[PDB]
Write a protein that binds this ligand. Structure first.
Ligand SMILES: O=C(O)C1=C[C@H](O)[C@H](O)[C@H](O[C@H]2[C@H](O)[C@H](O)[C@H](O[C@H]3[C@H](O)[C@H](O)[C@H](O)O[C@H]3C(=O)O)O[C@H]2C(=O)O)O1
Ligand SMILES: [Ca+2]
Length: 490
C-alpha cells in the first residue's frame, strides 16, 4: 500500500491513445509503470500501433460501437467537446469538485485554462496538456555557411533569398555536389508559415491553421487574399529548390537527416532541441553552427514570429460514458497535478532518467549528453506525452544550451512574437456549425495549400474555384458564427 493509492483493490482500465501520428499508450513505459505503482491504477493501451493518422484512429474508434475507459491524444479538444455534449464523454465538473483537490486548485488559479477547455454547456469534458514557457519556435540559420560564403546575416526577405540561393548553388559543405537543401523543417505546416515573409498569416496560435483577429474581425489565414499572393512566393521558392522538396513527406527526423548529413541550411523550430544539434554534431561536422536569427523584415516592413507557447494546448484526455470507475479515474488524473505526479510526467522516473539532488529533479548526464534531444527521450519512456498534465519548464531549462537561451532572450527582448489568438466563446448551436463544417474545411485548405506550394495547382487560377468550394463546404457559415461570437464577447 502507498499513501498515493487512489484505490485499495488494484484497478486496470483501457485507454485509447494514438498520438502525434506515430505513438500509442504503452503500459510498459517506465513512467506508466511508476504511476501505476503509486496510484494502484494500471492503464492498458488498445489503440493500433501501426497507424500514421491519429485523428483517423479516433474517428474509427468512435464509430466502432465500442468505447474504452479513457481516450487521450493530441488535437482532440474539439472532439472531446462535441462528443462530450453528445454524451460519449462524461462531464468532470462534479468529479473534480469532490475528488480532485490538485485540479480544483489549479483551475481556480488558472481561469484562462479553465475557460479554454470548458464547453458551451458549462461542462469540462477533458483535462488538457498544459505547456509551460513563453516562446516556442524561432528561425535558425547556418552561421558557418554564412561565414564560409562571406555573407552577412539576412535582414530582409530579399537578402534571405540571396542567402538561400547561395546555400543551394555555392556548395557550402564543399563536396562538389549540389546536395544542399537551404530550408528544412520537421513540420510540414511550417512551409505555410513562410507566407509571413510576404505579410500573410498562416495561423493565429500554436494550434495549426487557427483563426486570428485583425481590427476586431475574425479571419482565417488560408481564406485571405494575402495568402493567395503569399503562397505564390512560397511556391516560387519551392520551385527553385530553396524549400526542401520533401517538406510534406520528410517530417519527424528532418533535422537528424539534413543537419546530420550537412545539407540543411535553415529551419524554423523550437529553440532548445534545434540548438542542441550544435552539440550533437560538434565533432561530425567541425564548425557546425546553427544560430537563432531574428525574423527577416517582411513585405509589410515587420519582423514576425507567428508562433508562441499555447497554454493550454488542444490536447489531453477524457473519461468515457462506458467507464465504470469514474471516481478512481479522476483521482488518477488528479495525481498528475500533484508534485510527484507532475515531476514524473515531465522528467521520467527517479533513479532512471533523473535524480533528486538538493530536493530538485536533476537529469542524469547520460540524458543531457545524449544524441537525442531530451523531449524525444521523454516520449520514449512515457513523459512529455499529450495526456492531461502540467508541463514544468524546469525540465526544459536543463537542456536549453547557451545558444538556445540567448536566442530565447533575443526573441523575448525584441518582441517578435505576434499577439496570439485566444479563441472565441461559441454557443452550443454555433459550435454545432463549427464541428459540422470546420474539420473538413481545414483538411481541404491543407490539401489546396500543398497543391499550391508544390505547383500542381496555380493559386491565382484556382482562387475563384477555391472560394466557391469553401462556401460549399460551409466555411463561411463557420465564419459568420465566429464573428458573431467575437462581437458578443468584445
Ligand atoms: O523541441 C523542443 O525544444 C520542444 C520543447 C518543448 O518542451 C516541447 O517538448 C516542444 O514540443 C513540441 C514539438 O513541436 C514536438 O515535436 C511535438 O510536436 C507534436 C505536436 O502535436 C505539434 O503540433 C507538431 O505539429 O507535431 C507533433 C509531433 O510530435 O510531430 O510536441 C510539441 C508540443 O507542443 O508539445 O518541443
Ligand atoms: Ca555540396
Amino acid at each position: 500500500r502507498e499513501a498515493t493509492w487512489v484505490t485499495e483493490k488494484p484497478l486496470t482500465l483501457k485507454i485509447h491513445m494514438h498520438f502525434r501520428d506515430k505513438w500509442v499508450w504503452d503500459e510498459n513505459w517506465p513512467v506508466a509503470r511508476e504511476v501505476a505503482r503509486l496510484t494502484n491504477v494500471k492503464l492498458v493501451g488498445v489503440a493500433n500501433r501501426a497507424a500514421t493518422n491519429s485523428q483517423e484512429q479516433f474517428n474509427l474508434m468512435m464509430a466502432s460501437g465500442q468505447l474504452p475507459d479513457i481516450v487521450g491524444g493530441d488535437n482532440l479538444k474539439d472532439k472531446f467537446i462535441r462528443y462530450g455534449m453528445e454524451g460519449a464523454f462524461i462531464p468532470l465538473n462534479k468529479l473534480i469538485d469532490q475528488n480532485a483537490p490538485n485540479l480544483k486548485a489549479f483551475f481556480k488559479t488558472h481561469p484562462e485554462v479553465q475557460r479554454a477547455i470548458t464547453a458551451p454547456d458549462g461542462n469540462i469534458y477533458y483535462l488538457p496538456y498544459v505547456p509551460d514557457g513563453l516562446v516556442s519556435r524561432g528561425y535558425f540559420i547556418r552561421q558557418d555557411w554564412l561565414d564560409k560564403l562571406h555573407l552577412k546575416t539576412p535582414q530582409t526577405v530579399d537578402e534571405l533569398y540571396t542567402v538561400l540561393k547561395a546555400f543551394k548553388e555555392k556548395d557550402p559543405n564543399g563536396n562538389g555536389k549540389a546536395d544542399e537543401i537551404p530550408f528544412i523543417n520537421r513540420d510540414p505546416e511550417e512551409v505555410f508559415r513562410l507566407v509571413n515573409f510576404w505579410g500573410a498569416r498562416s495561423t493565429g496560435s500554436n494550434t495549426w491553421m487557427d483563426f486570428y483577429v485583425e481590427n476586431g474581425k475574425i479571419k482565417h489565414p488560408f481564406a485571405e487574399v494575402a495568402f493567395k499572393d503569399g503562397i505564390k512566393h512560397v511556391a516560387q521558392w519551392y520551385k527553385e529548390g530553396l524549400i526542401d522538396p520533401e517538406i510534406f513527406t520528410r517530417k519527424a527526423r528532418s533535422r537528424e537527416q539534413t543537419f546530420g548529413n550537412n545539407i540543411g541550411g535553415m529551419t524554423h523550430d523550437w529553440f532548445a532541441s534545434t540548438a542542441l544539434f550544435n552539440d550533437a554534431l560538434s565533432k561530425n561536422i567541425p564548425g557546425f553552427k546553427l544560430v537563432p536569427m531574428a525574423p527577416p523584415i517582411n513585405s509589410k516592413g515587420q519582423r514576425w514570429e507567428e508562433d508562441a507557447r499555447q497554454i493550454p494546448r488542444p490536447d489531453g484526455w477524457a473519461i468515457t460514458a462506458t467507464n465504470k470507475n469514474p471516481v478512481e479515474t479522476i483521482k488518477l488524473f488528479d495525481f498528475y497535478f500533484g508534485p510527484k505526479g507532475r515531476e514524473l510526467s515531465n522528467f521520467g522516473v527517479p533513479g532512471l532518467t533523473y535524480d533528486i539532488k538538493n530536493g530538485k529533479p536533476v537529469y542524469k548526464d547520460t540524458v543531457l549528453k545524449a544524441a537525442q534531444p531530451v523531449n524525444n527521450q521523454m516520449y520514449d519512456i512515457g513523459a512529455q506525452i499529450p495526456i492531461g498534465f502540467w508541463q514544468d519548464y524546469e525540465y526544459e531549462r536543463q537542456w536549453t544550451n547557451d545558444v538556445a537561451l540567448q536566442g530565447i532572450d533575443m526573441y523575448i527582448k525584441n518582441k517578435y512574437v505576434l499577439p496570439q489568438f485566444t479563441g472565441v466563446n461559441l454557443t452550443v448551436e454555433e459550435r454545432e456549425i463549427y464541428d459540422k463544417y470546420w474539420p473538413d474545411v481545414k483538411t481541404y485548405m491543407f490539401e489546396m495549400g500543398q497543391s499550391w506550394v508544390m505547383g500542381t495547382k496555380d493559386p491565382e487560377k484556382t482562387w475563384n474555384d477555391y472560394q466557391q468550394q469553401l462556401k460549399n463546404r460551409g466555411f463561411y457559415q463557420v465564419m459568420i458564427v465566429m464573428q458573431k461570437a467575437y462581437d458578443r464577447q468584445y
